[PDB]
C-alpha cells in the first residue's frame with residue numbers, strides 16, 4: 001500500500017549495504033563489522049579479531065580514518081578532518097605501535113597536515129605540511145624536510161593546486177613512492193601568475209564582516225600553473241645536509257610551452273614513467289626514465305618515447321591512459337583508441353614504437369584491473385553489446401584468442417555491472433555488483449575461478465522493499481540516423497502504457513558521460529516514480545562515452561551543440577512512444593547537466609514546459625582552463641572564440657519566455673562560480689522573463705550540507721509537482 | 728652574452744630554444760669577444776660546435792662544445 005517517499009530518500013530509510021574491504025596482504029583483509037575492526041581470511045576460511053573502538057576510546061577524538069603500515073607494525077590515525085575541495089582536505093594524525101597499541105608520544109606529526117602516506121613496503125611516512133614535503137623514516141624519529149619553497153596559494157610541493165586536483169589527478173597528493181620505498185617521486189606546482197577567483201563567504205551569523213575567499217583558478221584562456229617533477233632518494237637522507245632532489249624535465253616537444261603532467265607510474269625500483277599533455281590536449285608524450293646508479297641521476301631516452309595523439313579530438317577519456325608494467329619493466333599495457341575509434345588494450349615493447357592490440361571490436365575496455373605473469377584481468381562493456389554494463393574479463397597472455405568472462409554468467413538477471421578488488425598478488429578477488437539487481441558482494445579464488453562465499457547480499461534491504469511500491473527500470477536503445485543511442489527510464493509501479501505519464505528528463509550529457517546503465521540506485525528519481533508517478537528518463541547522445549570515439553568526439557570544439565540537440569530529440573522519441581503526456585515534460589540537471597538543461601530551455605523547441613538548472617555553466621570562458629580547453633580550444637580570434645560566443649546561455653535569454661525556469665546555485669561554489677548563474681539571471685532580467693531562483697549561502701558545487709541537501713530536493717519537488725499540477 | 732640554440736617543431740611550426748642548451752659567455756676583466764662574441768662553427772649533424780673564446784690564461788683559443796654540456800674543452 002505504500003511508496004518510496006521524499007523523506008525515505010532524504011532520511012535514508014532504505015540503506016544499501018556495502019562490503020568495503022581493504023587488503024593488507026595477498027591472503028587477508030579488513031572489515032568494519034559492528035564498528036570494531038576485524039581481520040578476515042580466504043585461505044582456510046577463518047576470520048579472527050584485530051581492533052575495536054575501545055582500543056582508541058580514551059583517545060578522546062573520534063577517528064575519521066585509519067591506515068596500517070604495509071608491514072603491520074604501525075597504524076596512522078586521522079582526525080580533525082576539515083574538507084577543502086573535492087579531494088583535498090586537512091587533518092591531524094597520530095601513530096600507534098600497532099603491536100602494543102600505545103601512541104608514539106614524541107616527534108608527532110603536525111596539525112593542519114595536507115597529505116600523508118606510507119611507503120609501499122616497510123613503515124616509511126611521507127607527509128605534506130605548509131605546502132612542503134617531509135619524510136619520517138621511523139615514526140618516533142624526527143622528520144627530514146625535503147622542500148623549503150612551499151608558499152600558500154603559490155607553490156605546492158607534493159600536493160596539487162585547484163585545477164590539478166579537480167581535473168588532472170582527481171587527488172590532492174602529488175607524491176609517488178617507488179615499489180620498494182627507496183625513491184619518493186613528486187610534483188611541484190607554481191600558481192604565481194594565475195588569477196584568483198574571489199567570492200564572499202558569510203560564515204556563522206557571528207561574523208560581522210563577510211570573508212572574501214581568494215583561489216588561484218585559471219578560467220578558459222588565462223595563465224596556467226607551471227609544473228616541475230622531481231625524485232629524491234629516501235635512504236641516503238642525511239641529518240646535517242639538506243636533501244637534494246633530482247629533476248626530471250619534460251621532453252622538448254612539451255617545453256615549447258604550456259603543458260601538463262597527467263600521469264606518473266613506477267615500473268621498477270629504478271624505472272618511472274611520466275606522461276605530458278600539451279595545453280592543446282590532442283598531443284601527449286610518455287617518457288620512460290631510468291635511475292643511473294653511478295650518477296644519482298635519472299635518464300629518459302628519446303627512443304623510449306611513445307606518442308599518443310588524436311586527429312579527431314582530445315587524447316583519453318579525460319586524460320591519457322595509465323600504463324601497467326610487466327615485472328621486468330621492459331613491457332607495458334595501456335588502453336588507447338584503436339584504429340577505428342574504439343578503446344582497447346595495446347601491448348608495448350619499451351624500446352620500439354609499434355604497439356599491437358590484444359582486443360578489438362565494437363565495444364570498449366573500461367580499465368585494466370590486474371596483471372600477473374600468467375594472465376591479464378580487465379573490465380569492459382562487451383557482454384550483450386551493452387555500453388552501460390560492466391563485466392570482468394581475463395585474457396591469456398600466451399594466447400590472446402583465449403579470453404574468459406569471469407563475471408558475465410554468474411548472476412545474469414541480477415548482475416550486469418561489476419567492479420573488482422584484487423589481493424596484493426591477485427590470488428583472490430572481490431566482485432562488486434552494483435545492479436541492475438540489489439548490489440551483491442562475493443569473494444573468489446582466481447587460481448581456479450571458483451566462487452568462495454557471499455560477503456553481503458543485501459537481503460535485509462530486499463526484505464523491506466517488498467512492503468514498498470518500488471519503481472521499475474527500463475534500459476534500451478533507439479536508432480537515430482542508423483546509430484544506436486541508449487536510454488534509461490525509471491517507471492512508476494504498476495506502469496500501464498495506455499496512460500499518459502508526465503516525464504522528467506534527467507540530464508548530464510557531458511563529454512564522455514553515461515546516464516544510461518545497469519546500476520541500481522535509490523535517489524530523487526526513485527521517489528518521483530514511486531510516489532508522484534513521474535517517469536524519469538536519461539539519454540546518452542552524441543558526446544557520451546564508452547561507445548567509440550565517433551560518438552564521443554562528435555562534439556569536439558562544439559560544446560552546446562549536438563548534446564543539446566540530442567536531449568530534445570530524446571524527448572520527442574519518448575513522446576512518440578505514446579505513454580508520455582506531451583503537455584507535461586520537464587528537464588533538469590546539475591553542473592554540466594545544468595548547462596545543458598538551460599540551453600535546452602533556451603532552444604525554443606517548445607517540447608519542455610519547465611526545467612531546473614543547478615550550478616550550471618553559463619558560458620565556457622568562465623570555467624577552468626584544463627577541462628574547458630580540452631573540448632573547446634582557446635577562446636581567441638585565431639582558435640575557437642566564435643563558438644565560445646555562440647554557445648552561451650545568456651544569448652538565448654529571449655526564449656525562456658516560453659518556459660518555467662528554476663535556477664539554483666551555491667554562493668561558495670569554488671568549481672562552477674556563482675558568477676555563471678549571476679550572469680544567467682541578469683540576462684533574463686534584461687530581456688524581461690520571469691523565473692524562479694534560489695541561492696544557497698556558503699554551499700559549494702555539491703550543495704552537500706545535510707540541511708541544504710534536504711532543502712534543495714524539497715524545493716525542486718515543489719517546483720516539479722506544481723509544474724505538473726500534482727496534488 | 729647568451730647563446731640560444733633553437734630547433735624547429737615539425738608538428739606546431741614554431742621554434743624552441745631549450746633553456747638546457749643555452750650557453751653563457753662572460754668576462755670579469757672586460758667586454759666579451761674581440762669586438763663582439765665569436766661565431767660558432769657547427770658539425771654536420773649540428774650536435775656540437777667549435778668557438779674561439781678566452782681561456783683561463785686570457786688567451787683566445789678554439790673551444791669544443793657539445794650542445795648539452797656547460798663546459799667545453801680547448
Ligand SMILES: *[C@@H]1O[C@H](CO)[C@@H](O[C@@H]2O[C@H](CO)[C@@H](O)[C@H](O)[C@H]2NC(C)=O)[C@H](O)[C@H]1NC(C)=O
Pocket residue numbers: 149155190192193
Ligand atoms: C614560480 O614562477 C614565477 C614566475 O611565474 C617565478 O618568479 C620569478 O622568479 C625570478 C627568480 O627569483 C624573479 O627574478 C622574477 O622576477 C620572478 N617573476 C615573477 C613574475 O614573480 C618564481 O621564481 C617561481 N617559483 C618557483 C619555486 O618555481
Ligand SMILES: Cc1ccc(-c2c(CN)c(CC(C)C)nc(C)c2C(=O)O)cc1
Pocket residue numbers: 166167170318510591592617623627671672
Ligand atoms: C561544468 C562542470 C563541472 C564539474 C564537472 C565534473 C568534473 C570535471 N571538472 C569531474 C572530474 C572528471 C575527471 C570526471 N567530476 C565531476 C563529478 C564533475 C561534475 O560535478 O559533474 C564537469 C563539468
Ligand SMILES: *[C@@H]1O[C@H](CO)[C@@H](O)[C@H](O)[C@H]1NC(C)=O
Pocket residue numbers: 092108109110111
Ligand atoms: C594540535 O593543536 C592542539 C591545539 O592548539 C594542541 O593542543 C596539540 O598538541 C597539537 N598537536 C600536535 C600534533 O602538534
Ligand SMILES: *[C@@H]1O[C@H](CO)[C@@H](O)[C@H](O)[C@H]1NC(C)=O
Pocket residue numbers: 148240241242
Ligand atoms: C636547507 O636549506 C634551507 C633553504 O634553502 C635553509 O634555510 C637551511 O639553512 C638549510 N637547512 C639545514 C638544516 O641545513
